[PDB]
């Protein structure tokens, strides 16, 4: 039973909206409903937090921060400099003003946010050498977020994360495919992709880059001009954290808070081939997957580059190996669930049969009891104890 009183926030990946985005089709449920009001309505304070699909780690963190506290998004000046964007974004009311007096929550995050939701912890905890120097050797000001000694999470829940990356990226066409990935997306909520709708729909929120969708252009058209666009050529990109050394780098610096629980939960829709070695999609796959991506996934191996039988094992979008935590250039710490929820390590959970879109509802399954997977993960989240006394 409950022993904290945290609420939730929910964290998406490369895809992403706000609620109120594409017609009220949630992220957070898909075609089986709304995860964030199930919990609500079980007793389970819940929020949804909606940051740049496409961005870099650092600049979603940036925003999550900042929707988390309020205020106007501050990507850093060291940062801003370095990669050529805007300083300041979008700003915020502020989802959850408690936590500057003291409040922590729990974060559960699907695909790529549980690459952001890690380094949100980093930043809060240790802030960045890097922002501090820069303030003092240019005279700038700076964000709270860089300072370090904020303790906003108590923990950290994972789905279908990337932390050493998808071998996906490689794809010789991965640009086309990427988006038409996105396409697919759309579709799955009833959009089309190449009609102008005049409402907003899907904002990609680049405000640090300028860009954004434009009057007579359809989301065909904008994800062209997106494609040559700096969001999908520099190195400060989703597309860049995504790949396997973007990966390493990033788990360099982002290390596991010895104050914070980490929960891993890692997804597979895929079986072997005897002959072959392979990894082939399941039944039931997103459509797109099946077609595009889990065949590749399933077979590309590069020795150079550490890719090898383990990492064929997919769900449709990331290789599982990739899951169950950080392990490529880090030094964190990953223990096997054994009915003991331990601090500062990756619990990892266990493989679940389903694929990247089912674990969240965006692609129906229907052996699948959604609600009752994530109301069980809200009653683990809810047992956690801050205080842990060490014993027998
Ligand atoms: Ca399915
Ligand atoms: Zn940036």
Not at 224 to 231: F, H, N, Q, T, Y
Request: net charge neutral.
């Amino acid at each position: 039973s409950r022993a904290n009183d945290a609420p939730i926030v929910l964290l998406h990946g490369f895809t992403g909206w706000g609620r109120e985005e594409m017609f009220g089709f949630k992220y957070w449920g898909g075609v089986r409903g709304d995860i964030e009001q199930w919990l609500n309505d079980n007793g389970y304070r819940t929020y949804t937090l909606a940051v740049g699909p496409l961005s870099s780690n650092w600049d979603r963190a940036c925003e999550a921060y900042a929707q988390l506290v309020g205020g106007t998004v501050d990507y850093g000046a060291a940062h801003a400099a370095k990669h050529g964007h805007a300083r300041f974004g979008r700003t915020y009311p502020g989802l959850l003003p408690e936590l500057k007096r003291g409040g922590r929550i729990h974060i559960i995050a699907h695909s790529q946010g549980g690459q952001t939701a890690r380094m949100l912890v980093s930043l809060l905890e240790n802030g960045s050498q890097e922002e501090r120097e820069y303030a003092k050797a240019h005279n700038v000001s700076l964000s709270p977020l860089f300072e370090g000694g904020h303790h906003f999470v108590l923990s950290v829940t994972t789905i279908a994360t990337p932390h050493d990356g998808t071998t996906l990226v490689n794809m010789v066409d991965f640009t086309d495919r990427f988006f038409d990935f996105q396409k697919f997306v759309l579709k799955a909520a009833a959009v089309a992709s190449n009609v102008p709708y005049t409402s907003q729909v899907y904002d990609f929120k680049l405000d640090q880059w300028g860009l954004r969708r434009q009057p007579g252009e359809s989301f065909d058209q904008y994800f062209e001009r997106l494609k040559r666009s700096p969001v999908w050529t520099s190195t400060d990109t989703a597309r860049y954290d995504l790949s396997v050394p973007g990966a390493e780098k990033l788990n360099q610096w982002v290390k596991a808070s010895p104050n914070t629980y980490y929960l891993s939960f890692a997804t597979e829709r895929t079986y072997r081939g005897a002959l072959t070695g392979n990894y082939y999609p399941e039944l039931g796959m997103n459509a797109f997957s099946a077609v595009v991506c889990a065949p590749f996934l399933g077979s590309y191996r590069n020795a150079t580059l550490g890719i090898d039988d383990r990492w064929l094992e997919n769900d449709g979008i990331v290789n599982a190996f990739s899951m169950n935590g950080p392990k490529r250039g880090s030094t964190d710490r990953i223990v096997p669930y054994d009915g003991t929820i331990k601090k500062g390590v990756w619990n990892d959970m266990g493989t679940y049969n389903v694929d990247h879109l089912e674990v969240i509802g965006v692609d129906p399954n229907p052996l699948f009891d959604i609600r009752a997977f994530y109301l069980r993960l809200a009653e683990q989240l809810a047992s956690l104890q801050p205080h842990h006394h060490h014993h027998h």
